[PDB]
């Protein structure tokens, strides 16, 4: 498969800036969701999950085709709870009917990070909605109960190296796990709708204890009321991962620069951009525009 980016016909920077302003104004407005966390966290989880299906070997999956709109991918167990991010974005898609799904799903992830005071993420337009038979089979997204060897190996399919995996996992500063969606329960930290290097500081500074939760799964619980998944705790058990965790715990700017590069790489995998395509867009936040 080749997937060539095609700009939505006749649209420029300013049209996409309005779709960004619309997602961001609705983030401000529906601030009550999930006990006042807001929709920001489930929108960057949605952007990672439609992108994390990519397979570098046959170029199938990933964000291009917008295939989460189809029932098979939508009812994948691994995607339980994402229906809330989809429901949020659907009024915005009725308002801007010209934007493709893959561009809407991935721009939601970019708007959420920058409006939660994260770094600027360069974004590119150009995904095209492809048919229901290009929709990937379930089982391409990662298990929760595993170790650092599984983590390295899984991310090799999307060809992320060690630094990119650790920068990307820092998004777990946001949101929380929910027992009814995944079988795990609890937040990774305290400021869970602000984007900081907190996930790394907690992994290193808390006194984690292994215990079973009410679903019968294991997780690392700390005295402060925080949790860590087996896959998150893996990052201080592996000597290569642990040096990068420490680097981000000591330097938030270095984490912001690396997360920014790795998150755009995640959202662009499997997509060929023609040299005539526009440069990546840097959107202004509500606040920078005075809105
Ligand atoms: C080995 C990799 C990963 C595993 C096993 C994993 C697993 C999970 C699980 C089990 C949840 C909670 C689901 C629920 O109960 O609602 C979750 C939530 C979340 N994940 Fe990860 N994750 C991984 C990677 C990532 C990456 C790379 C990103 C983003 C760049 C990400 C972003 C999020 C966010 C923001 C949430 C919070 C969602 C909410 O509050 O509803 N995850 N993840």
From Swiss-Prot:
Requisite cofactors: heme b
Enzyme kind, highest EC tier: oxidoreductase
EC number: 1.11.1.5
Residues with the Phosphotyrosine modification: 150
Main location: mitochondrion
Keywords, comma-separated and alphabetical: Heme, Hydrogen peroxide, Iron, Metal-binding, Mitochondrion, Organic radical, Oxidoreductase, Peroxidase, Phosphoprotein, Transit peptide
Record-listed heme b binding positions: 172
UniProt GO MF annotations: cytochrome-c peroxidase activity; heme binding; metal ion binding; peroxidase activity
Free-text comment on the cofactor: Binds 1 heme b (iron(II)-protoporphyrin IX) group per subunit.
Residues the UniProt record annotates as site (Transition state stabilizer): 45
Origin: domain of life: Eukaryota
One Gene Ontology cellular component annotation held by this UniProt entry: mitochondrial intermembrane space
Modification after translation, per record: CCP1 precursor is processed by the rhomboid protease PCP1, which cleaves the N-terminal hydrophobic transit peptide. The m-AAA protease (composed of YTA12/RCA1 and YTA10/AFG3) is required for CCP1 maturation: m-AAA protease promotes membrane dislocation of the CCP1 transmembrane segment within the transit peptide to ensure the correct positioning of CCP1 within the membrane bilayer, allowing intramembrane cleavage by PCP1.
Statement: the UniProt record of this protein carries the keyword Mitochondrion: yes
Catalytic activity: 2 Fe(II)-[cytochrome c] + H2O2 + 2 H(+) = 2 Fe(III)-[cytochrome c] + 2 H2O
Subcellular location: Mitochondrion matrix; Mitochondrion intermembrane space
Phenotype upon changing residue 188 to F: Substantially diminished activity
Any one Gene Ontology BP term: hydrogen peroxide catabolic process
Residues of the active site: 49 (proton acceptor), 188 (tryptophan radical intermediate)
Subunit structure as annotated in this protein's UniProt entry: Forms a one-to-one complex with cytochrome c.
UniProt miscellaneous comment: Present with 6730 molecules/cell in log phase SD medium.
Role noted for this protein: Destroys radicals which are normally produced within the cells and which are toxic to biological systems.
Family: Belongs to the peroxidase family. Cytochrome c peroxidase subfamily.
Protein name (record): Cytochrome c peroxidase, mitochondrial
Gene responsible for this protein: CCP1
């Amino acid at each position: 498969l080749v997937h060539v980016a095609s700009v939505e016909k006749g649209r420029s920077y300013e049209d996409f800036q309005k779709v960004y302003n619309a997602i961001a104004l609705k983030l401000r407005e529906d601030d009550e969701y999930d006990n006042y966390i807001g929709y920001g966290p489930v929108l960057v989880r949605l952007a990672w999950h439609i992108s994390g299906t990519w397979d570098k070997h046959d170029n199938t999956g990933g964000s291009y085709g917008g295939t989460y709109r189809f029932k098979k991918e939508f009812n994948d167990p691994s995607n339980a709870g994402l229906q809330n991010g989809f429901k949020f974005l659907e009024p915005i898609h009725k308002e801007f009917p010209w934007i493709s799904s893959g561009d809407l799903f991935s721009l939601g992830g970019v708007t959420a990070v920058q409006e939660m005071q994260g770094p600027k993420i360069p974004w590119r337009c150009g995904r095209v909605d492809t048919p229901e038979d290009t929709t990937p089979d379930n089982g391409r997204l990662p298990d929760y109960d595993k170790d650092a060897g599984y983590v390295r190996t899984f991310f090799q399919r999307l060809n992320m190296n060690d630094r990119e995996v650790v920068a990307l996992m820092g998004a777990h500063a946001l949101g929380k796990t929910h027992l009814k969606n995944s079988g795990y329960e609890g937040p990774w930290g305290a400021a869970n709708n602000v984007f900081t290097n907190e996930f790394y500081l907690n992994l290193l500074n808390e006194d984690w204890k292994l215990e079973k939760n009410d679903a019968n799964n294991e997780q690392w619980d700390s005295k402060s009321g925080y949790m860590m998944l087996p896959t998150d705790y893996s990052l201080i058990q592996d000597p290569k991962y642990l040096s990068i965790v420490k680097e981000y715990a000591n330097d938030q700017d270095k984490f912001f620069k690396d997360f920014s590069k790795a998150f755009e790489k995640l959202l662009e995998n499997g997509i060929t951009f023609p040299k005539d395509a526009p440069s990546p867009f840097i959107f202004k936040t509500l606040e920078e525009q005075g809105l």
